[PDB]
Amino acid sequence: SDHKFLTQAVEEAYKGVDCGDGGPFGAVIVHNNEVVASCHNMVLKYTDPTAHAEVTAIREACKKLNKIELSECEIYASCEPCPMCFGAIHLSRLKRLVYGAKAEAAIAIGFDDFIADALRGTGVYQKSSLEIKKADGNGAAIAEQVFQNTKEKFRLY
Amino acid sequence: SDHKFLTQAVEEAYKGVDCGDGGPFGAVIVHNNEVVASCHNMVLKYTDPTAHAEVTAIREACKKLNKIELSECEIYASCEPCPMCFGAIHLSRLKRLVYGAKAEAAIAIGFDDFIADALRGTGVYQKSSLEIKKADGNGAAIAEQVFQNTKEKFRLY
């Protein structure tokens, strides 16, 4: 089931690049096997630098569930969440994060070297507690392929 | 100039908890002497845990200026930005941050012990070149006192 939702997040990444909405990033928030939110980066569409895929998915899942905390839900990020998004994931109380590509894969195509210490275990003032799974095998493969397949098909931001 | 906009952010914090919009946090984004956006925490009003004061101000300023970068602008935060908000400030290319109260004054009244490594300079991966000013003197004291003045006039989140 992990692979299914991670694949849907990668699909959102491609969808958003095709739409012109933003960069090649997707995020799916699930209440067990029920998709509560399926989003991609909306920075260009919304004129909003905070509208990353994960932040957008959190906003939509909270509206869907009519609550400000998502302790029952898990988040699948096509890319390793950035400091802002991992902060949002912390605040939302999501109980588990599954991400596909290491941040270096997105950084390699020109996004900022902007990595969340608290996610990688080098946080000091930010203490993460949620379950974190970095994808391997085919999940890592598709997530990393996103950035080679979408190269030069979107404006960087 | 710093003191005027910091105190405006504090006034936003008070107005927001009075309205029931969210917690006692305000944020003001300025282009030299011109205020671009003036906001407070909207987490309760929006059912959105990402709607901190700083994020809300960033969203509104970007929409007002029709651009996703704020490199001519500075942000005034009544409280030390959290990891989410500091990440959002980094992504928005804001050129300077001034904040009033240290995070500990908010933690004192029950908010999460949730502090941005990159702001305090404690990270391995995330490092910030943003110019950061912690307020001193009168502005600092006014900002720190908001939490004891607003103790239980709002719902915690």
Ligand SMILES: O=c1[nH]cnc2c1ncn2[C@@H]1O[C@H](CO)[C@@H](O)[C@H]1O
């Ligand atoms: O919607 C997004 N989701 C995840 N990362 C993003 C997004 N947009 C831009 N980046 C950028 O990709 C790099 C790797 O984390 C970071 O620079 C991050 O800000």
Ligand SMILES: O=c1[nH]cnc2c1ncn2[C@@H]1O[C@H](CO)[C@@H](O)[C@H]1O
């Ligand atoms: O709108 C807000 N702005 C800044 N911090 C906030 C806001 N809402 C809640 N907190 C919380 O206050 C503590 C100290 O910074 C942190 O736990 C942060 O998440």
Ligand SMILES: [Zn+2]
């Ligand atoms: Zn992000």
Ligand SMILES: [Zn+2]
């Ligand atoms: Zn914040």
